[PDB]
Design a protein around this nucleic acid. Structure first.
Ligand SMILES: [Mn+2]
Ligand SMILES: [Zn+2]
Length: 207
RNA sequence: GGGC
RNA sequence: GCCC
């Protein structure tokens, strides 16, 4: 509101922990980014650097719940109850912490661009691989086969009617990279963010 | 064609 | 279904 003036969603302590964690990102390595949800109301964010296997992956509660339940049916299949424990402030904090003039690669750059610009990061350069749906998802099964344990949010049925595999920001990054590289490596990935930064963890008794 |  |  007009009388509310809060600069950050995170405490300085957590902002400093975030800054340190993001030193694991190489400012010059190929970096994929993808989101689920609208750029004005994102619910899942992923960045991925195949060179190290490092990824950033986190969630956000939707503001437009009617649009969300609709988007879930046709794209992401994310159960909204599973988004309760998420850290507010993380989307802005992570985007603000990205290196100046970083080059980010994506599939369909329009939504990624709107998100970054809404966060004042017009300095970030975007490379759109601009593949067909078919070509971009050649390694879709192979990626889910290998990395399913990295995201459990996508349990809703998604339709195109015909049922299709749900869209995950993290699996998307991995499979798009596989498509461009012409193959998928078998390698163990590494989460950049601490678990307690991404979700509300931690009571012995109610009240 | 894309994106959710 | 909605968005470019
Ligand atoms: Mn996308
Ligand atoms: Zn996911």
């Amino acid at each position: 509101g007009a009388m509310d003036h809060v600069e950050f969603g995170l405490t300085y302590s957590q902002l400093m922990t975030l800054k340190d964690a993001m030193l694991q990102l190489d400012p010059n390595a190929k970096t994929w980014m993808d989101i689920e949800g609208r750029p004005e109301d994102p619910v899942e964010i992923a960045l991925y650097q195949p060179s190290s296997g490092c990824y950033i992956h986190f969630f956000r509660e939707p503001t437009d719940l009617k649009q969300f339940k609709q988007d879930a049916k046709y794209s992401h299949g994310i159960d909204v109850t599973d988004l309760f424990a998420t850290q507010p402030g993380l989307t802005s904090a992570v985007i603000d912490a990205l290196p100046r003039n970083m080059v980010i690669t994506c599939q369909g750059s329009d939504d990624i661009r709107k998100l970054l610009e809404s966060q004042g990061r017009k300095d970030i350069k975007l490379i759109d691989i601009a593949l067909s749906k078919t070509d971009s998802r050649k390694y879709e099964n192979a990626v889910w086969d290998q990395y399913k344990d990295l995201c459990h949010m996508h349990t809703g049925v998604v339709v195109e009617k015909e049922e299709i595999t749900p869209h995950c920001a993290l699996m998307d990054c991995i499979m798009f990279d596989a498509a461009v590289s012409g193959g998928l490596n078998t390698s163990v990935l590494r989460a950049v963010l601490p678990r307690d930064m991404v979700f509300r963890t931690s009571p012995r008794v109610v009240l």
